[PDB]
Amino acid sequence: ENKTVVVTTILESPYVMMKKNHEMLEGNERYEGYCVDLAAEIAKHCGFKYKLTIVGDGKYGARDADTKIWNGMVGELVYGKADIAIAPLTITLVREEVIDFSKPFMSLGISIMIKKGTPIESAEDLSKQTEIAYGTLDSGSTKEFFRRSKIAVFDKMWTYMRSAEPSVFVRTTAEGVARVRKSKGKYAYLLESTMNEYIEQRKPCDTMKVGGNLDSKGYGIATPKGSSLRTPVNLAVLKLSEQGVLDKLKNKWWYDKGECG
Ligand SMILES: N[C@@H](CCC(=O)O)C(=O)O
Numbered sequence: 271e272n273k274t275v276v277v278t279t280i281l282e283s284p285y286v287m288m289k290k291n292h293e294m295l296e297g298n299e300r301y302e303g304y305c306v307d308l309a310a311e312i313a314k315h316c317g318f319k320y321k322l323t324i325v326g327d328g329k330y331g332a333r334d335a336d337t338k339i340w341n342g343m344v345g346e347l348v349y350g351k352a353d354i355a356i357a358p359l360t361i362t363l364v365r366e367e368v369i370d371f372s373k374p375f376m377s378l379g380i381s382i383m384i385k386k387g388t389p390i391e392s393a394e395d396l397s398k399q400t401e402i403a404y405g406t407l408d409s410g411s412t413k414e415f416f417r418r419s420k421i422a423v424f425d426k427m428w429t430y431m432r433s434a435e436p437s438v439f440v441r442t443t444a445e446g447v448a449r450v451r452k453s454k455g456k457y458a459y460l461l462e463s464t465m466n467e468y469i470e471q472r473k474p475c476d477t478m479k480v481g482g483n484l485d486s487k488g489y490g491i492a493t494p495k496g497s498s499l500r501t502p503v504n505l506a507v508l509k510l511s512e513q514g515v516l517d518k519l520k521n522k523w524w525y526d527k528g529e530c531g
């Protein structure tokens with residue numbers, strides 16, 4: 271109701287993407303995606319004006335164990351470069367310790383992406399074998415999941431992953447997909463089911479989600495501690511949930527324009 275709200279987001283399909291013609295557009299009109307639509311609904315239910323900005327270091331948010339600094343969208347909120355994050359940003363404990371999250375707007379889990387035909391059905395399968403390399407996004411909740419897991423199978427996978435040479439990790443999702451596509455069934459990618467399910471409906475239609483999800487978690491809208499936005503945004507997400515907006519949006523951006531029939 272007083273100041274333009276600065277929004278940190280990340281270029282990640284289908285959440286935030288450059289519009290074909292963006293170079294001829296100004297401001298928020300540059301971008302399109304599920305999070306852009308969601309930003310707009312949240313902004314009008316809460317009554318604020320906003321500026322979309324893409325995170326500077328193109329990352330999600332992790333705390334460096336020696337430096338102690340938060341990078342990613344999280345750091346932008348921690349250090350006060352942004353007022354709010356509207357992104358496929360996973361609700362985790364170490365983040366919820368330093369920022370607040372709204373209730374989840376998307377439910378998801380860690381899943382496996384394979385090039386179609388790869389003889390893999392599950393995480394147990396991957397752990398039990400050696401021909402097919404597999405990794406995660408370099409920085410993010412998927413990598414931490416494996417880092418911290420006490421469960422045999424995921425420990426076994428982490429043990430392999432962190433020592434694998436050359437690196438099984440990737441700077442971006444799109445980097446992970448491309449490596450799956452290019453690697454003849456010899457790389458499998460570990461990513462949240464949402465992104466898996468999106469790519470699966472994307473040409474050349476050569477990838478696929480196998481098996482069950484490895485976990486159950488959420489993406490949440492993040493705000494810095496003490497923000498006057500915390501409560502109105504949490505309420506808006508619930509309103510958008512209850513009225514079916516979040517299902518319309520997921521359908522719009524995953525399935526309405528799916529290329530694999
Ligand atoms: N959504 C994740 C990033 C993607 C991933 O880690 O697989 C996060 O907030 O860290």
Ligand SMILES: [Zn+2]
Pocket residue numbers: 311315
């Ligand atoms: Zn509305």
